[PDB]
Structure formats: C-alpha cells, structure tokens
Amino acid sequence: MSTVTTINLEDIKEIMHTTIRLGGKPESGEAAELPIFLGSSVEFEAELYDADGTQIGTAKGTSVIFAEADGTVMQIVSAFDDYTDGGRVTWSGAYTMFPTDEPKSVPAQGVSGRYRGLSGTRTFQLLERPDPGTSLVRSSLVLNG
Amino acid sequence: TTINLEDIKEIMHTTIRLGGKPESGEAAELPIFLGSSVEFEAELYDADGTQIGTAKGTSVIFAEADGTVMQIVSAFDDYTDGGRVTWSGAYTMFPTDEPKSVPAQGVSGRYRGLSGTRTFQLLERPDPGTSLVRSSLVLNG
Ligand SMILES: CC[C@@H]1C/C(C)=C/[C@@]2(C)[C@H](C)C[C@]23NC(=O)C(=C3O)C(=O)[C@@]2(C)[C@@H]3CCC[C@H](O)[C@H]3C=C[C@H]2C[C@H]1O
Ligand SMILES: CC[C@@H]1C/C(C)=C/[C@@]2(C)[C@H](C)C[C@]23NC(=O)C(=C3O)C(=O)[C@@]2(C)[C@@H]3CCC[C@H](O)[C@H]3C=C[C@H]2C[C@H]1O
C-alpha cells in the first residue's frame, strides 16, 4: 500500500509482433486422449517507444484465450518489459476480451533496476493492426512502492 | 537476502472448464478457440501442517509451434506473515506428474524486491475439484 516512490510511464507506443495460433482439439499424443482444448494463443515481442520515437525498452510474453464460468471470454497473459535503463518489469493477469479496442490492464511488478520492489499496473490498448503480424498498442506503466 | 520455502504442501481446489469453440456472441465471429482452464484456490502448509498462506490463480492450456502442449499460469501466494508473491509463466503439460516451475516475484512484506522461482508438482487428485500438490519457493536479490 505504500507509495513513497512513483514511476509513471504514459503514452508508450508499443509496436508488437504477434505470432498467432488457432488452437483447437489436440490432434495426437497424450493430449488427444483428454477432452481438452488448446486455446488460441498470441506469442509476442514488442519494441517500446516514448512519444518522441526514442526506444525505451522491449516487451515479450504470451496471451491465451479462455472463458470464465459465466461464459465471458477472457485472455490470460504472462509477460515482462525490459527497459533501456537496465531493469525489468513483469506483468501477468487475466482481462476481458471484448470489446477488443478498449484499454486492458493486469498487475505489474518491478523486479530489477529502478523498478525493483515497486508494484502497480501495466495497461495496453489496441490502436490498429496494419497487418496480420503487427499490433500498434498504446500502453502505460504505473508503479509505486 | 534469500528466502527458501522448501517442502510446501498445497491442498488445492480446482475448478476445471474444458473450453472449446465459441458458438454465440462476438467470439463466434472470430477465429478462436477457448482453451481448457483451471481456476484454483489453495491453502499452503509447511512440513508440520501449519498453514503458512494461500494461493490463487488460473492456468490455461495451449500449444507452441512444434506442437508441445503447454499450460500458462498467472497466480499469487499470500503468506500469513503478511507478504504476497506473484508467479506466472508457461510450462510443459506433459508429463503431468513431474515438477513444474515458473518465475516468481516478491511484492510485499519481507518478500518485496526479491525474485526467483515457484515450483509445484502434483501428488494426487482424489476428485476433479481437488489436487494435493508439493511445492517450493525460492527468491533472492
Ligand atoms: C483483449 C483484446 C487484445 C488486447 C491486446 C492488445 C493484447 C495484447 C497486447 C496481449 C498482451 C498480446 C496481445 N496483442 C494482440 O494484438 C492481442 C493480444 O492478446 C490479440 O489478442 C489480438 C491480435 C487477437 C487474437 C485472437 C484473434 C483476434 O482477431 C485478434 C484481434 C486483435 C487482438 C485483440 C487485442 O486488442
Ligand atoms: C502440467 C501438469 C499439472 C501441474 C500442476 C500441478 C499445475 C497446477 C498446480 C497449476 C498451477 C494449477 C494446476 N493444478 C492442477 O491440478 C492442474 C493445474 O494446472 C492441472 O492441470 C490438472 C488438474 C489437469 C487439468 C486439465 C485436465 C487434466 O486431466 C488434469 C490433470 C491433472 C492436472 C495436471 C497437473 O499435474
């Protein structure tokens, strides 16, 4: 709950390369013996820019689609940011999928560099998909502690 | 400073959803499948039976390019001495009875600012809502 130090990174421009798999019913192996489904998944790598076009870091992570008990469609992500000043911020959580163009967020944790020991929120919002491989995302990071 | 919680015993309550193809709503208009998911809550015990905390999270099934079936988890422990440790990552589904681990981040209490690894291994599944797990946490920095 303590918020002695604040880090507030706003207006991050996140150019994200998305590798997308459809998923579905497993085709072979051990998994085909079970009544499971492989969720659609997004493996992503992104460059992070400030509003001047200066790179401030990179991000990397995986998202998978699932549904909550009432049937609300969700995505779960595990990811981290590496910033140019030499520290890492992890972020992971579940967020509602629809609408796909509203802001999403999950909790974030600073693990090294100036971020260490600080916690808060990583946000991301899809602005456009210039091609099936690419997402232009507007992001922000708020950490305190 | 390093924290090494060995030999945690986890009594975990699992709600499983099988997922599948969406058949109504916005999702049915898109090329997607809902992966099988495990929502869980667990009580964490030391090797004496004393409760030291609780864990909560979700795991979801997916596959990597070469076809390896994986699970991705996002979770956190709240330890009774006041601190929280988040943990998340992807691990191989098979074999289902070997130890798995993902990265962990201490965020409050004596854990704040330390990072490392959360480990978990299935011991028994008496019913589809219940998993007995053997676990470990280590953090440093
Ligand atoms: C909840 C909506 C998300 C929010 C968002 C920005 C998330 C990410 C940054 C996530 C951390 C990695 C990510 N990047 C992504 O671009 C993304 C991702 O999950 C998508 O899911 C995708 C392609 C979708 C896939 C399935 C078929 C869909 O047709 C597809 C469409 C758009 C986004 C939807 C996104 O707007
Ligand atoms: C990859 C093996 C995991 C590792 C493990 C212990 C993981 C957890 C602690 C995870 C953090 C939540 C968890 N607990 C779980 O009990 C669990 C889990 O994902 C399962 O996947 C489950 C039931 C499965 C579900 C689908 C249908 C399967 O039939 C089912 C079988 C057993 C485990 C498999 C586990 O042995």
Can you put this structure into words, describing what you see?
Two copies of one chain form a homodimer. The first copy, chain A, has 145 residues and is mainly β. Chain A has one domain (6-144): Allene oxide cyclase-like (AOC barrel-like). The first copy, chain A, has one helix at residues 29-32, and strands at 6-21, 41-49, 55-67, 73-83, 88-96, 104-110, 119-131, 134-144. Chain A has an eight-stranded antiparallel β-barrel with strand order 1-2-3-4-5-6-7-8. In chain A, strand 6 and strand 7 form a beta hairpin. The longest helix of chain A has 4 residues, at 29-32. The termini of chain A are close together. Chains A and B meet through helix 1, strand 3, strand 4, strand 5 and strand 6 of A and strand 3, strand 4, strand 5 and strand 6 of B. Bound molecules: the ligand CC[C@@H]1C/C(C)=C/[C@@]2(C)[C@H](C)C[C@]23NC(=O)C(=C3O)C(=O)[C@@]2(C)[C@@H]3CCC[C@H](O)[C@H]3C=C[C@H]2C[C@H]1O (2 copies). The PDB classes it as lyase. The entry lists the keywords PloI4, mutant, 2+2 Cyclase, exo-2+2 adduct, lyase. It forms a dimeric assembly. The crystal structure of PloI4-C16M/D46A/I137V in complex with exo-2+2 adduct. Chains A, B: PloI4.
Assembly context of the chains: homodimer
What is the topology, as strand order, of the major beta sheet of chain A?
Answer: 1-2-3-4-5-6-7-8
Name the structural class of chain A: mainly beta
The description of the largest β-sheet of chain A is: 8 strands, antiparallel, barrel
Q: Please bin the fraction of helical residues of chain A.
A: under 10%
CATH superfamily of chain A: Allene oxide cyclase-like
CATH architecture of chain A: Beta Barrel
Strand segment count of chain A = 8
Total discrete domains of chain A? 1
Gross morphology of chain A is globular
CATH topological fold name of chain A? AOC barrel-like
Using CB atoms under 8 Å apart, which protein chain pair has the greatest interface? Answer: A-B, 46 and 45 residues
Tally of alpha and pi helices of chain A: 1
**Order of SSEs of chain A:** EHEEEEEEE
**Broad CATH class of chain A:** Mainly Beta
PDB class: lyase
Keywords: mutant, exo-2+2 adduct
Assembly: dimeric
Entry title: The crystal structure of PloI4-C16M/D46A/I137V in complex with exo-2+2 adduct
